[PDB]
Design a protein around this ligand. Structure first.
Ligand SMILES: [Mg+2]
Ligand SMILES: [Mg+2]
Ligand SMILES: [Mg+2]
Ligand SMILES: [Mg+2]
Ligand SMILES: [Mg+2]
Ligand SMILES: [Mg+2]
Ligand SMILES: [Mg+2]
Ligand SMILES: [Mg+2]
Ligand SMILES: [Mg+2]
Ligand SMILES: [Mg+2]
Ligand SMILES: [Mg+2]
Ligand SMILES: [Mg+2]
Ligand SMILES: [Mg+2]
Ligand SMILES: [Mg+2]
Ligand SMILES: [Mg+2]
Ligand SMILES: [Mg+2]
Ligand SMILES: [Mg+2]
Ligand SMILES: [Mg+2]
Ligand SMILES: [Mg+2]
Ligand SMILES: [Mg+2]
Ligand SMILES: [Mg+2]
Ligand SMILES: [Mg+2]
Ligand SMILES: [Mg+2]
Ligand SMILES: [Mg+2]
Ligand SMILES: [Mg+2]
Ligand SMILES: [Mg+2]
Ligand SMILES: [Mg+2]
Ligand SMILES: [Mg+2]
Ligand SMILES: [Mg+2]
Ligand SMILES: [Mg+2]
Ligand SMILES: [Mg+2]
Ligand SMILES: [Mg+2]
Ligand SMILES: [Mg+2]
Ligand SMILES: [Mg+2]
Ligand SMILES: [Mg+2]
Ligand SMILES: [Mg+2]
Ligand SMILES: [Zn+2]
Lengths: 110, 153, 148, 118, 307, 99
RNA sequence: CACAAACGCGUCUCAGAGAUAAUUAAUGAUUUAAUCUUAACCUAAUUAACUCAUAAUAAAUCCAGCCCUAGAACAGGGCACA
RNA sequence: GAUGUUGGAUCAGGACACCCAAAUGGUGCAGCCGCUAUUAAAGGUUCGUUUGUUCAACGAUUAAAGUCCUACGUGAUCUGAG
RNA sequence: ACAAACUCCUAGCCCAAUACCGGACUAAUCUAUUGAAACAUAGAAGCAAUAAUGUUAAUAUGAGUAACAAGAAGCCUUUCUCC
């Protein structure tokens, strides 16, 4: 089918300036109790999740260092250590990961 | 019409979606925490959860074993399933898994992304949401109702 | 075109002509060239007529400047604060004369559609119609179906 | 007193009011008698409606028009009544309205034969 | 002012959460068990049975379907309908609604306060019931009227009767013209191109428009329809469960509106039924576990032998 | 263009507006239009319809007097034609000439 | 029928009152018999339409999120038990 | 400087000059069939073999298998055997 | 009664038209003299565009429509899953 007549700027306006086509204001926006940045109420803080992600990555590298193959994965639970720490009896008998950074604020010792 | 359908249709078809979930489950069971597409993860969660109740059936059970054979691609991973993952889950029936929604991917496609995890993995704690503390004016206003529900009983 | 322009009701400037009529034209400024042909008529007018016209009308000032101008012009100005522009460009003496006399007799008001020909304050002497005016009243001022 | 309309001629019988739903076979022809039977107000409303100019304001002046089957009026609308209009037709009285004075006053035209029975 | 989105559960600590929940559920049990006793409270005038009467109806929950048999040997399927919480809400007098029959507002099963709206929870706190899911209106003659805030049970209908069932029908969504209407298709194989389903020509050449009636692909099935002529077979007194005949419109576990048949044949069937309604308090007798119609093969029984 | 054809129409429009006004006030006195106008003429009163209508809006008194005049003359005409004799001239039926 | 569903080849269900047209009839005048009457008064008996009883629908504004027999989008129903 | 044409497929809208169902009048109407006239258009008006075929013939039925108008309805929905 | 381009009235620059035909003006250019802030007499011409499916350039409309692409997770180049 072929359009019979050029449409007006009026008609075009009322089509694409229509409220249903508009970008609505999201009202679930809040601030992070931690870093005072912003996140939607139901979603993790991007920034905090970032600190996390980085740390996780480094850990995974250092546990790719203790592993000498593509297929070699431990049969024991593992735990991570930081400057100035020691395996407890509860946590000994497990694979240990020795990292350089001091134990971060958010990360607990457990 | 979809009424009462329990599965989302992913990948090239039925079998494809299954091998998709194969990889996702493999990765979950190796790395213990993964982020991926919300639907794919939400979907996977069921599989991740029941795999652990196969693990709970012991290294000896045959059904459970070839099950994990199929469902874990790196064969290396099958021990970690029975020896590691399954025993550290005993008391908790179904509480294996944390799945949360992460900010939308920063690629141009901008998908809706989640992260999925085995509780009691050794990894940095996900920055979960906390409830408000009990010093908050509102909760505090409820502790009064609380103690006066104790005092009239 | 009617819907094109503004309008004005018919009006007097400062209620002119009521107490005493006051010629509304204030000053005239002629600009012409002693040399250029374009001003030819307006030169002759300046010679012969201007003088007498001035005597005709005490109330108006006339400023006449020869200057090196190529388009002869006369600018009326009015007590109304209004100003009107004109070209005397290439016109006869007769022509000019008639035009200056046009300027002489104007309101200074603007030429726009004049909505109706009659300006009347309080047209309504002896009354102005309202609905009741021709209706007979009843006893007690009762409604149609009201009872007492 | 809308229900009490008079219709000259047999018009009760042959004037039909039509309208269409817009659905195929949804077309409706109705005898005036029937219509008025169902809804007293209609007849007059259609007369007045069809009688205004056909522009928009008809719709609006249709608002200022209040129509009552009998004399039952909200004391709201009773309260604001200005004036009464003259009845546009002089209603003929039945036989039984006439005073005996006027009955006697009108002359006996023909003298009937006594023998004849009535 | 940028005022934020708020739901109830937001700022509640781990501690107060179950407290809120218990508090509410408890005041629910209290609220329902309170008006559990209608007849001694302030029962409205009970009126005799007038011939042109219309009884109140009910709100049910469609359970499932089950086969059931007649002493004659023929087989049926019947609907398991369960009243859960049926409490009349408000009452509109005759002239304030239809100018003909007065209307009786009735409530459905109970739900969470947290997810409803202020106006409503206010209305309910001025009655003192917990919140209902579905709220319908029954047209009723002034001698059937009850006191609002009153309970209702499945003994309202006695076995053998016919009833009427209204519900939101199963939604198929936006469906094609085959299914929405029952148009034939075009044949599949003899060379059709991209036609095998489409509605075919929708109109006439000379009309040059299409008619306001015309049947066309669109929204199908989520909408209200009513089945008539449904016999009731069996009532379960303890669990409040009606067995109605054949099929009732709606999905299983959806909310339903039952009444007596306004069908012509069944018009006067009201005289023999518990009318204002049925009343557990007043008779002070217990009705049996189940009420069967006389046509009915019972779950334990002779095991019929023809003769 | 439409402007010009309109310029010619405008005068019709006005006249109709007028006539209806005249009609309206005439009605208010219980007198139809044509009767009013003619029987106003027969009294040797030439009045425009413009000025008539403005006498009906802004001069209800004067106007009511006018309609009375014409009413008077009309009935005087009914009796003039019904009388069937030459002697009576209604006091307003007389036809003046100029001086 | 390899999904908790859809689905037919399967199961369930479907209605009173009024109003007429052509015809029949009864009382009965114009024309004192008769005559259903483009005469009144009441009347009767009489197709389909078509109106209407009756049924549907019918509580204005919490809605982040997550479920859903609700759904293309948007809307709709759920999320206190347990 | 194109109003794309037969037949079928789909979906029908309309008419009444009625093929069914409905209410009747007349009969060279006993009754059963029949034949004619009146009134009524809400609903219906089949499956096959042969022909591109519409007609038509034939097989079997049915309460009947109506006559028509819609660009000989419908090809920006299909079909081209013609 | 109401109702025209007819006819009155008050003023006038004082009476419709396609093809063909006669007349009076005038836009904008340049040249000759004037003019000088836009100019007036003549003389000349590539002398005036709401319409050629006109030519070139640019912009709209259809339209943000139709349409197009990158197997998964991670330790970032290791593993899987497929053809
Ligand atoms: Mg689903
Ligand atoms: Mg896909
Ligand atoms: Mg889910
Ligand atoms: Mg649905
Ligand atoms: Mg098919
Ligand atoms: Mg195909
Ligand atoms: Mg093709
Ligand atoms: Mg004129
Ligand atoms: Mg007789
Ligand atoms: Mg007789
Ligand atoms: Mg109705
Ligand atoms: Mg909601
Ligand atoms: Mg063309
Ligand atoms: Mg074309
Ligand atoms: Mg049809
Ligand atoms: Mg006929
Ligand atoms: Mg028949
Ligand atoms: Mg038909
Ligand atoms: Mg041939
Ligand atoms: Mg042939
Ligand atoms: Mg043939
Ligand atoms: Mg054709
Ligand atoms: Mg064709
Ligand atoms: Mg077409
Ligand atoms: Mg061919
Ligand atoms: Mg005239
Ligand atoms: Mg040129
Ligand atoms: Mg141009
Ligand atoms: Mg041209
Ligand atoms: Mg073209
Ligand atoms: Mg062009
Ligand atoms: Mg564009
Ligand atoms: Mg897009
Ligand atoms: Mg489009
Ligand atoms: Mg697309
Ligand atoms: Mg690809
Ligand atoms: Zn943060």
């Amino acid at each position: 089918a072929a359009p019979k007549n050029r449409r007006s700027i009026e008609v075009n306006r009322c089509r694409r300036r229509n409220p249903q086509k508009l970008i609505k204001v999201k009202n679930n926006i809040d601030v992070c109790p931690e870093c005072g940045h912003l996140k939607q109420k139901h979603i993790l803080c991007g920034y905090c999740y970032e600190k996390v992600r980085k740390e996780t990555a480094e850990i995974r590298r250092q546990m790719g260092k203790q592993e000498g193959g593509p297929f070699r994965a431990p049969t024991t639970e593992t735990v991570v250590l930081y400057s100035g720490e020691t395996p407890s009896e509860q946590d000994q008998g497990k694979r240990i990961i020795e990292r350089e950074r001091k134990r971060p604020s958010w990360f607990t010792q457990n | 019409i979809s009424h009462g359908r329990v599965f989302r249709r992913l990948g090239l078809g039925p079998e494809s979606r299954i091998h998709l979930l194969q990889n996702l489950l493999t990765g979950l069971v190796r790395h213990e925490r993964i982020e991926a597409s919300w639907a794919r993860v939400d979907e996977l969660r069921g599989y991740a959860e029941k795999l652990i109740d196969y693990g709970k059936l012991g290294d000896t059970n045959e059904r459970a074993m070839r099950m994990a054979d199929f469902w874990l691609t790196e064969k290396d991973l099958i021990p970690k399933l029975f020896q590691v993952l399954a025993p550290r889950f005993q008391g908790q029936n179904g509480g294996y898994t944390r799945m949360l929604q992460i900010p939308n991917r920063n690629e141009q496609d901008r998908a809706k992304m989640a992260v999925i995890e085995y509780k009691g993995n050794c990894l940095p704690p996900l920055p979960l949401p906390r409830r408000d503390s009990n010093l908050t004016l509102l909760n505090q206003l409820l502790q009064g109702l609380r103690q006066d529900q104790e005092a009239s009983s | 075109t009617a819907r094109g322009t503004a309008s004005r009701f018919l009006t007097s400037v400062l209620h002119n002509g009521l107490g005493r009529y006051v010629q509304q034209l204030q000053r005239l400024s002629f600009s012409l060239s002693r040399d250029a042909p374009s001003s030819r008529g307006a030169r002759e007018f300046v010679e012969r007529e201007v003088t007498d016209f001035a005597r005709r009308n005490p109330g108006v000032v006339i400023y006449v400047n020869p200057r090196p101008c190529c388009v002869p012009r006369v600018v009326a100005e009015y007590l109304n604060g209004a100003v009107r522009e004109e070209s005397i460009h290439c016109k006869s003496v007769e022509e000019i004369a008639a035009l200056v006399q046009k300027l002489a007799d104007q309101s200074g008001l603007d030429v726009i559609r004049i909505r109706k020909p009659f300006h009347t304050d309080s047209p309504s002497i002896q009354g102005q119609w309202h609905p009741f005016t021709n209706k007979p009243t009843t006893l007690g001022g009762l409604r149609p179906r009201e009872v007492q | 007193n809308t229900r009490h309309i008079a219709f000259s001629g047999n018009k009760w019988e042959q004037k039909v009011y039509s309208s269409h739903t817009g659905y195929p076979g949804g077309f409706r022809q109705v005898t005036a008698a029937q219509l008025h039977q169902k809804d007293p107000v209609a007849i007059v409303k259609l007369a007045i409606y069809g009688m205004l100019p056909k522009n928009l304001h008809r719709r609006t002046m249709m608002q200022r028009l209040h129509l009552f089957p009998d004399e039952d009026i909200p004391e709201d609308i009773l309260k604001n009544l200005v004036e009464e209009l003259p009845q546009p037709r002089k209603v003929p009285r039945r036989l039984d309205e006439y005073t005996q004075e006027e009955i006697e006053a009108f002359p006996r035209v023909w003298s009937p034969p006594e023998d004849y029975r009535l | 002012h940028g005022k934020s989105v708020t739901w109830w559960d937001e700022h509640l600590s781990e501690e107060n959460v179950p407290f809120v929940k218990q508090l509410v559920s408890d005041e629910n049990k209290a609220q329902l068990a309170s008006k559990l006793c209608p007849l001694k409270d302030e029962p409205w005038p009970i009126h005799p049975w007038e011939p042109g009467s219309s009884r109140v109806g009910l709100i049910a929950l469609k359970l499932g379907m089950m086969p059931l048999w007649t002493k004659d040997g023929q087989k049926h399927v019947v609907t398991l309908l369960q009243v859960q919480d049926c409490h009349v809400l408000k009452y509109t007098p005759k002239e304030n609604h239809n100018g003909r029959m007065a209307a009786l507002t009735v409530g459905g099963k109970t739900v969470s306060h947290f997810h409803k709206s202020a106006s409503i929870l206010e209305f309910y706190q001025e009655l003192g019931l917990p919140p209902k899911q579905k709220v319908k209106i029954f047209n009723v003659t002034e001698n059937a009227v009850i006191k609002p805030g009153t309970p209702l049970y499945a003994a309202h209908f006695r076995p053998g009767q016919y009833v009427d069932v209204t519900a939101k029908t199963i939604g198929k969504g936006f469906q094609g013209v085959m299914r929405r209407w029952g148009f034939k298709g075009q044949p599949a194989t003899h060379g059709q191109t991209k036609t095998h389903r489409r509605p075919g020509a929708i109109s006439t050449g000379d009309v040059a428009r299409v008619w306001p009636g015309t049947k066309m692909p669109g929204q199908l099935g989520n909408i209200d329809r009513t089945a008539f002529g449904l016999k009731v077979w069996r009532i379960n007194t303890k669990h409040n469960i009606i067995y109605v005949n054949g099929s009732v419109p709606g999905h299983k576990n959806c909310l339903v509106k039952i009444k007596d048949s306004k069908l012509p044949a069944y018009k006067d069937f009201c005289k023999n039924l518990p009318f204002p309604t049925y009343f557990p308090d007043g008779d002070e007798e217990a009705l049996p576990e189940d009420l069967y119609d006389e046509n009915v093969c019972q779950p334990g029984a002779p095991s019929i032998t023809f003769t | 263009v439409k402007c010009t054809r309109a310029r010619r129409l405008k005068k019709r429009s006005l006249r109709t507006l007028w006539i209806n006004r005249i009609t309206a006030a005439s009605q208010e006195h219980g007198l139809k239009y044509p009767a009013f106008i003619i029987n106003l003429i027969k009294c040797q009163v030439e009045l425009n319809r413009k000025v008539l209508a403005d006498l009906a809006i802004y001069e209800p008194k004067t106007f009511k007097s006018l309609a009375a005049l014409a009413k008077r003359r009309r009935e005087e005409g009914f009796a003039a034609a019904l009388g069937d004799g030459k002697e009576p001239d209604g006091i307003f039926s007389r036809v003046v000439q100029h001086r």
